[PDB]
Scaffold this active site. Structure first.
Site, PDB file in Angstrom:
ATOM      1  N   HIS A 129       0.717  -1.196  -0.036  1.00 33.32           N
ATOM      2  CA  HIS A 129      -0.039   0.093   0.100  1.00 33.32           C
ATOM      3  C   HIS A 129       0.674   1.293   0.041  1.00 33.32           C
ATOM      4  O   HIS A 129       0.683   2.197  -0.877  1.00 33.32           O
ATOM      5  CB  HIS A 129      -0.915  -0.011   1.247  1.00 33.32           C
ATOM      6  CG  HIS A 129      -2.040   1.339   1.240  1.00 33.32           C
ATOM      7  ND1 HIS A 129      -2.129   2.055   2.231  1.00 33.32           N
ATOM      8  CD2 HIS A 129      -2.857   1.577   0.317  1.00 33.32           C
ATOM      9  CE1 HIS A 129      -2.878   2.908   2.117  1.00 33.32           C
ATOM     10  NE2 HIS A 129      -3.349   2.788   0.830  1.00 33.32           N
ATOM     11  N   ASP A 159      -5.981   2.424  -2.167  1.00 35.96           N
ATOM     12  CA  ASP A 159      -6.719   2.217  -0.764  1.00 35.96           C
ATOM     13  C   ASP A 159      -7.570   0.884  -0.850  1.00 35.96           C
ATOM     14  O   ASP A 159      -7.745   0.293   0.117  1.00 35.96           O
ATOM     15  CB  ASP A 159      -7.600   3.144  -0.764  1.00 35.96           C
ATOM     16  CG  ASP A 159      -6.692   4.475   0.111  1.00 35.96           C
ATOM     17  OD1 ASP A 159      -7.391   5.689   0.226  1.00 35.96           O
ATOM     18  OD2 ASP A 159      -5.495   4.220   0.364  1.00 35.96           O
TER      19      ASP A 159
END
Length: 122
Positions: free
Chosen positions: A47, A89
């Site tokens: 991420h 996300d």
């Protein structure tokens, strides 16, 4: 932004996002990356890497649009950066969900993040 990120994680994992991942391992939550401690941690590692590929928007402050369709996070088709940000996300929420089977509470509150081994380049 952080709000959407936390909401997605809650939706995918069903867990208090800040509680379970705010300081998890060496990559989840606060701070940068570090050598992943487990799969959940790697999700956050990926991420943060995903965020680096972003240019034009602020991952932590910039809000973006997305919806819950058939229990799936669907990113709105806004500007390119917000779009990619949203996908970053979405990907981590999904990844965290997928690795709940090995999520370990012992890594939950790693206040020793600064001591984590240096992360390799993305």
């Amino acid at each position: 932004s952080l709000f959407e990120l936390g909401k997605m994680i809650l939706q995918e994992t069903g867990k208090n996002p800040a509680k379970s991942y705010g300081v998890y391992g060496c990559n989840c939550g606060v701070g940068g990356r570090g050598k992943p401690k487990d799969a959940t941690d790697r999700c956050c590692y990926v991420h943060k890497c995903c965020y680096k590929k972003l240019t034009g928007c602020d991952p932590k402050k910039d809000r973006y649009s997305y919806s819950w369709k058939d229990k799936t996070i669907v990113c709105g088709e806004n500007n390119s950066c917000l779009k990619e940000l949203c996908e970053c996300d979405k990907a981590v929420a999904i990844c965290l969900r997928e690795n709940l089977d090995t999520y370990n509470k012992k890594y939950r509150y790693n206040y020793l993040k600064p001591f984590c081994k240096k992360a390799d380049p993305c």
